[model samples]
Target chain A: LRAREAKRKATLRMLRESLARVGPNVVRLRDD
Target chain B: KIKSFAPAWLNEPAPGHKLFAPKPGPRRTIARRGTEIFVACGKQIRWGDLAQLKESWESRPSDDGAATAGYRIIKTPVADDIRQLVMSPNQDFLAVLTSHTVHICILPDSSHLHIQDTTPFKPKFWTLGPTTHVTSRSAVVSAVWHPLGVNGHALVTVTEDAIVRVWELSTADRWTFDAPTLAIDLKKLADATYLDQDFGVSTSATNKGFSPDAFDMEVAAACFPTRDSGGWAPMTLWLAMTSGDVYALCPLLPQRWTPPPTLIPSLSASIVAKVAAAEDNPESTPEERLVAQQQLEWMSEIDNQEPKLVEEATGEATIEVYTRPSRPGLVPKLQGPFDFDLNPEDEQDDEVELKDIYVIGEKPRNGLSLNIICLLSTSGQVKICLDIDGVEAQWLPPRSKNKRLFAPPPEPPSLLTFQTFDTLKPAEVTPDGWPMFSEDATSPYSFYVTHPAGITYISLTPWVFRLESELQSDSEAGTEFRIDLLAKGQGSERDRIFTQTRTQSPLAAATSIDDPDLGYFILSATQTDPIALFFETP
Candidate 1:
């Protein structure tokens, strides 16, 4: 249980870091 | 009927007609210049604009084969002198709030701002406001006009700096002005609540819930709203905080307010009577049915109940039951099995049985009274707080005939019906077959030659005589003459040929005859299944 909790925390940290790296000028094109 | 045949010389050669022809398809034409479509999205500011926004419309063809493609543009003169544009209630005047001050501008003619007339395609009026009240920065979020409710109000703009502002052109002063009072709660009123409950739970533990100041010590958001109900009064302002607390501020008046009289008097009375009767006779109905019926009856009764004066105790009743939590030293929780009663029986016992039962000792005759608002939060938290000036209690007028309730009328009749061939058949050929000739002849002698004759003359028409009859006669001339075998033949080759021809030409008819071919008979008097009738009241 302790190991599982540590893995989950690490995953959440990585996700937050990835989201922070996204640029403000990025534009997402919608599909027709 | 006469049988006639065209002479061999009169039989002429014929040619076939062409079967296929080109059809005229739909054509499209463009008459005016077209504008390019664009979409914008963002957190701070998102906008969509057309290429080269024009003050007047110009037609442009969108694509090939457009039916009608033309657009026009018209220009108007500007009335205000603002650098930026802020939409007024009717968009007739623009109020611009800049860094140093606010200014008003009339649209279209202003050289500073290009007023685009996009009415033909996508037309909209633009509004601009200050981003923050403390600084001169422009607002990141555009001011949005509320489309519903009353009109002629200022535009409301919310800034990213958590400041909401309103701008409008004052008619009395003929100048743009910011609303004096920015209605919002101070920092101290904003507070969060932490409770021992999940995200989707409806009720929370009373004891486990605590304020944000007691928990994380973080400030919450506050919302202040003003609404105007139909009356000759200012808009009523409501203050709400992140902690799920609401407060309404209104002027106090000695005059009481009452609900409008119900339109369906008999129905309203019957509903109230039913509710009273149900409360009196609960044992007669099933448990679930009685519960549902009682709820409906209670709702109707409440609507019909007359509100008494502020000072009078109109006997407002509510049922409440409390239960001890499985864990102690927490909040007091309420349990089910609650019921309302007219008379208080065994008040001491009721209080003792219930975990938390606080009864008001006596009613106050005057002065501002505080009422507690209790609600089940989404986090399973039972929040109970005293709203000092939440609602005003008033007396309603006595049940009167003036109240009117309107119900929808029945739906219109349906015109859709099934179509069939029997309804389209003509009236003429009602019965069985009538004799018709294949051709016309000038005289009876010629008709007899073409058609059947009464007398048997084998020698005169030897080539046309039936060979089967001659074979059957076997040289017995007198017998053949008397027998009339050609007319009344049995198992003869000629008879078989004639029968085959008649069967093959069952629907065939003479062209000269008034009646055309009898293609088929129609079956009438049959009815299709009736469609299910759906009805609605207006």
Candidate 2:
């Protein structure tokens, strides 16, 4: 449980960071 | 769980004895849109106005009955038992999929709705039988309306024989489907692809002895991302296999492909080049060859500047000529047989069939923008793949380099098994279940999943809000950070999940928060009972 939880957190962090790197036009296109 | 109104339709009479029984209702068969509820009961489809039906609920003293007046039955040309019913995105057409065939019909408009009759309305519909006339065609595993088809008149069906057929119903005069507009042999494509190279090879040394074959392909479900999913998602289609493998075809446009004004000329050139190349073939008749040449001429017209087109064309825009005697011109990029990584601690099984797949776009109002893919396995396990576009980019050849001819096969996206959520244990799992989505445009973050145990309503709204706040607070994080997925205790935002066990044989389920008083409702029918249970969510 402990190891899996740590792994889950790591995965979440990577996903959040990747999402943050999207370009403005793509973001606006999706947002609108 | 609050069980509210149970309005039974009169046209649907009580069932016979229990000893010898007909087939039960199939899950995710019922579809609700606006004030209407369309339910599939065996071979027939019954629908009625929800508001009026509820008002006239229970037997009235009048000799001329009123409750039965609200609902109408639709007679389909399905020879066998009706398996599923799918409505187009705009509710213009309804495609009824039976055990052996598929039927597409135009829904009754305002003029016909007023005429209340139990006599089944036989609308002008076209039937699509087996792909090949030689023997029995494979049973249809799933069917979905193209979300971005020309006026949403396209229907896509994947059968058990590993064949995907796309049917376009944009024309009014067409009455029959002698052949689908586009048919893809997924089995041949998968066997040729490198995805199955490591099929039987276990990752660990101490592997179970269960042998797995990568050849025999059976598609479990297929879905297209809603228009709101943004980018080319509306044009993309995802197919999931029973073997826990998923594949996707991006920019799978309808026969009449149209580009918006903002569409870059280079991308339009890719489409034009693809369609024109498909038509331009050696085996074509003289007239056909002339038409192909005309198509090529039109390609240059979409973007008249030929020199800039050559320079801007990317390596990923390559289209190969598929050699099928039936379709000499069809060319589509079939990408991935991506296997979902399993949990490490759990005993891995060689046979994990994905039951259904749902794709929803990130609502801009939620402050996050990403296409979310929900994969449901037969074991009631839900796997969420976030930011699908991020991984899909790997399938394309890198830009500015025109060496796609020699470029190596693209690498498959890494599977994050940590995001897998076990919704049901072995005991709770049923033979069939599918996730039901809302028809309203505003609510894409939530979907209702029906199992024999009950209906599980999952909403991702709270999680999105939490992530939006977190990204706003942190200065280092980019403003474009989207809250795509995750929980409360596991250092992630927990999904708001609720379950209702009021109905038996929960065939299909849907939810809508668009109107007042009718914020949400779920219609479920059981095998023994002829009446369907309609629950009004508080």
Candidate 3:
């Protein structure tokens, strides 16, 4: 259970990370 | 019938035969671009030219000297069952809405593409859907191109899971599939809800219900919107759910921006770190900590590839939809199980339901183009509003009293009655029971409404007249007069509503094709008694 909970946290963190990585540039999807 | 209708003469079963009896739905699977017709026939899209159909029907002889009457039938393959089809006004492409994804196929100016040789099967286009499970969870409820989006055309898709996405085509991402740039979370990004009396009411959905923010709205229909700029056209999307929630959205994301897809972060050591942090928090409850840790772990399972950044763009020049949905929540609260001796079985999907929606920009009145949305409900309530203010993207009955996404609605200044109409008194079985009158006398469903080619076919009363008259005088009324559908009820709005409000311009033909220029039909292949006019525009 602890390991599973640990995995979930990593995922949410990764979600937050990827979203931030692609952050402002997310809006400009054409040729920027 | 318009100018070019040739009797459909083909082998096997004709239209009315036991073979081609169309599935009984309100969807018109055929779309027109001038004299050309694009039809959704099962898993295939058949394109036929009106000129050729007319010529062949008149009489064309083969080399053997035998005369044959048949036009070209080009079959393009579509995977799932077709739900709807929307065409670009300029005749460039056709937005094909099937079960899962929307395929924007490039249409030839005046001819059909012959792709019978399926060598990797793909036309010059894009498929907008889920990355891995393209046809999995949700079927696409609606798909329409921005009348003025860039080439490959900016397409908008609404899925049953209540997700709205905008996918734009580009030259840079030619070889690679272009992912949707904007994943709009309607429930989260709505500027204001229908229940907000100050901002939306007098014209919002929440204004009709008993509770301030109760009941739910599920997206049921959508429209492809074209906005004419002062020379710079913008794309606005209009959407509605069965719960009678209608809203609008416009994209401000420019074309010069080219953002690559987000990268999935490595799961390295962050897994156990989050759980450890939550565990060390003395301020949080023990059970709360467990839930937090559990949620984190579950997220990791699906985090291999980020869930594709959905629903975070709250600001991008997004001034939203203005609509007043039916207060469907009032029905459950107004009537208990024993409220009256009514048929509970009749209204299987009634509570959270909108009949249909048509998005059309009316002709210019005072040099202003008006985008008019005609909204109807299962019980025969129609609310048509012009440019007002904001709208709600989502509506689900709140689980608790303190449920508020943005803020608590302003307290009611004056208590509005549960019943929203006066003639409504004319068609109720019991005074307090939910109104369950038939859409029209003959229509089977509680409501039967379909809006195609700017003409609304409904089973509701000529109730739009009152809305039209009120808006014309109301402060929100404007000069751009868009007269798209919603004059009368079509199939089965119900017999009750139709019989009572017999005030409607009856349709001599059908709800589709109202042009005086084009026409087409189908005669029996064997020249039998059942000569069917497949379609005619008049």
lDDT tens per residue, model 3, B444-495: 1113232211122333223323333333433332312222122111212322
- Could you tell me the TM-score of chain B in model 3? 0.49
Every model: Cα RMSD to truth: 38.5, 12.9, 19.9
lDDT of 3: 0.37
A-chain TM-score per prediction? 0.60, 0.59, 0.63
TM-scores of chain B alone in all candidate structures, in the order given: 0.21, 0.69, 0.49
- Highest DockQ model number: 2
Model 3, runs deviating above 4 Å: A1-32, B1-28, B60-70, B73-77, B109-125, B130-133, B175-177, B190-217, B224-235, B250-352, B362-371, B378-382, B386-511, B514-538
**How does residue B8 of candidate 3 score in lDDT?**
45
Q: List the residue pairs that clash in candidate 2.
A: B242-B353, B487-B492, B487-B493, B487-B494
Model 3 CAPRI quality: incorrect
What is the per-residue lDDT of model 2 for residues A1-32, given as tens digits with 9 covering 90 to 100?
A: 12432333444565545434331101000111
What shift in Å separates residue B287 of candidate 1 from its native position after superposition? 42
lDDT ranking from best to worst?
Answer: 2, 3, 1
Error of 2 at B402 (Å): 11
Model 3: fraction of native contacts: 0.00
Q: What are the models' TM-scores?
A: 0.21, 0.67, 0.47
Q: What is the interface RMSD of each candidate, in Å?
A: 44.8, 15.6, 25.6
